Amino acid sequence: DVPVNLYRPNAPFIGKVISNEPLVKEGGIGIVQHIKFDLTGGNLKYIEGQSIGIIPPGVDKNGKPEKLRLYSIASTRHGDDVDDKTISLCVRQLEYKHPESGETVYGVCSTYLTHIEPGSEVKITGPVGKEMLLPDDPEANVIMLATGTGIAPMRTYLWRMFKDAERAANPEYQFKGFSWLVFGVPTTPNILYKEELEEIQQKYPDNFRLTYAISREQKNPQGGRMYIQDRVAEHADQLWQLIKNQKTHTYICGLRGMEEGIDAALSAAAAKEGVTWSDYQKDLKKAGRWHVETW
Ligand SMILES: Cc1cc2nc3c(=O)[nH]c(=O)nc-3n(C[C@H](O)[C@H](O)[C@H](O)COP(=O)(O)OP(=O)(O)OC[C@H]3O[C@@H](n4cnc5c(N)ncnc54)[C@H](O)[C@@H]3O)c2cc1C
Ligand SMILES: NC(=O)c1ccc[n+]([C@@H]2O[C@H](COP(=O)([O-])OP(=O)(O)OC[C@H]3O[C@@H](n4cnc5c(N)ncnc54)[C@H](OP(=O)(O)O)[C@@H]3O)[C@@H](O)[C@H]2O)c1
């Protein structure tokens, strides 16, 4: 019964930004912001795993209106306020060099948001998606593989799982299963939510496992940069075993560049046990326990 598109892209909800706290601490790379909007009075309800769209002002080169962009929701259904009045996004300002002219180029909607001023009205659409929904089963297991801003939904799971206030507010959902987040980022200053993430590993040690793949501070066995799939291979067998359990849901959010690695590792660990991942997986997917959201 997931609520979808309570706001079409042609009648966006206009909400005021509440805060735009920065997530990349000194020294890290780029900019990644934690923007919280205020939905009060709009009836825009959503559930962990979904994502909303933001429509920047302006028009493109071709003179047409700037089409919306998606963004995984980073807050739970209650918002960081635990009052059902807000919603928050985890947004990295896009910034690259022109394939030919060297000129630095920033992204449109991403710079718009990363620099959005608290108190500014922002066009919001959605929520959409039913592929990253967290199972209601408190006894389920959650393996989470994400990179960069891909942590956004993982935050919405983890929070709804271990953040006290949430526990208090969600009597029906008192997590007891096992969760494991393999988080891929460039540097330590870039470990988005490092504070809370590592905090939850305190409160609930036997229920949350945080593995980091800090790409530019860690080298993998082959000499290369430590990426998610490397970690996923380091604890391959374990993961595989934890994946065979029928109460285990896996969630992947980030660059499809990982899918290849993750499949490679898991498929191998699945061979030692005479099993064909490519097919077993096809099932997890059909079963609805292989949630993948890449961009
Ligand atoms: C389901 C989904 C979830 C998402 N979740 C998040 C999230 O939580 N956080 C987040 O930031 N984004 C997320 N995004 C991405 C979001 O849609 C936008 O792509 C992003 O925020 C950039 O917006 P922009 O307007 O700055 O992009 P634009 O400025 O419009 O840039 C996009 C264009 O830039 C060009 N381009 C990009 N890089 C280069 C380069 N290296 N060299 C040459 N050309 C280049 C390409 O032509 C591309 O079409 C998500 C996307 C989807 C599909
Ligand atoms: N995070 C994402 O899932 C994602 C999604 C789409 C686009 N991007 C691009 O990167 C920016 C990401 O910013 P962000 O905060 O989302 O993420 P981020 O902070 O850049 O984190 C991305 C992480 O992904 C790692 N990575 C790079 N190539 C990979 C690959 N081949 N396979 C697996 N992991 C890989 C990176 O390693 P190195 O950087 O050290 O190579 C880095 O540690 C975007 O603006 C866009 O340019 C990222």
Give the topology string: H per helix, E per strand.
Answer: EEEEEEEHEEHHEHEHHEHHE
**CATH uppermost class of the largest domain:** Alpha Beta
Give the CATH H-level superfamily of the largest domain: Nucleotide-binding domain of ferredoxin-NADP reductase (FNR) module
Radius of gyration: 19 Å
Beta-strand share of residues: 25-35%
Helix content: 25-40%
Count of extended strands: 13
Bound molecules: flavin-adenine dinucleotide, NADP nicotinamide-adenine-dinucleotide phosphate
CATH architecture of the largest domain: 3-Layer(aba) Sandwich
At CATH level 3, the topology of the largest domain is Rossmann fold
In one word, what is the shape?
globular
Number of helices: 8
Looking across the biggest beta sheet, what order are the strands in?
4-3-8-1-2-5
The biggest beta sheet reads: 6 strands, antiparallel
PDB class: oxidoreductase
Keywords: oxidoreductase, FAD, flavoprotein, FNR, NADP, NADP reductase, phycobilisome, thylakoid
Assembly: monomeric
Entry title: ferredoxin-NADP reductase (mutation: Y 303 W) complexed with NADP by cocrystallization
